[PDB]
Symmetry: C2
Subunit: 81 residues, 2 copies
């Protein structure tokens, strides 16, 4: 659960990127990022900024989409050393 | 033609109608692309196709990323749906 992030309106994209890299740095090899509704685009932009930084060092392990009546996306990312 | 790009003008139900008609016309797989704001919209099109077609439609592939469109950087989602 500490490597499970929910994207909300509260923080900037860049804050969630830093949150994710800190979790990776702390030894969680995988982090889940969840976004729903208007924050699906935000979650994808968090992923894009992570890839921009880490390149091969991060891998998109799994993408789930669905409804929970609002849409959601769930991304599983893996740090690779 | 079976490569749909979601915009702000059309409603979700028109894209749903669009996809089902492509399915019946012989396009077994339809691609739905949404960028930036319309990522959430594209997923909603998918969810309604599921809500009406149930197991008659399968999510084959989901791509996410960023790219440059009309010289602005945008996030995108690409959904490939199979009938």
């Amino acid at each position: 659960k500490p490597n499970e992030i929910v994207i909300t309106k509260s923080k900037r994209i860049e804050d969630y990127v830093l949150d994710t890299i800190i979790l990776f740095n702390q030894g969680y090899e995988e982090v889940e990022i969840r976004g729903s509704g208007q924050e699906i685009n935000k979650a994808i932009e968090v992923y894009n900024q992570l890839v921009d930084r880490l390149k091969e060092g991060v891998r998109l392990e799994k993408v789930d989409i669905g409804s929970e009546r609002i849409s959601y996306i769930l991304l599983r990312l893996k740090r690779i050393y």
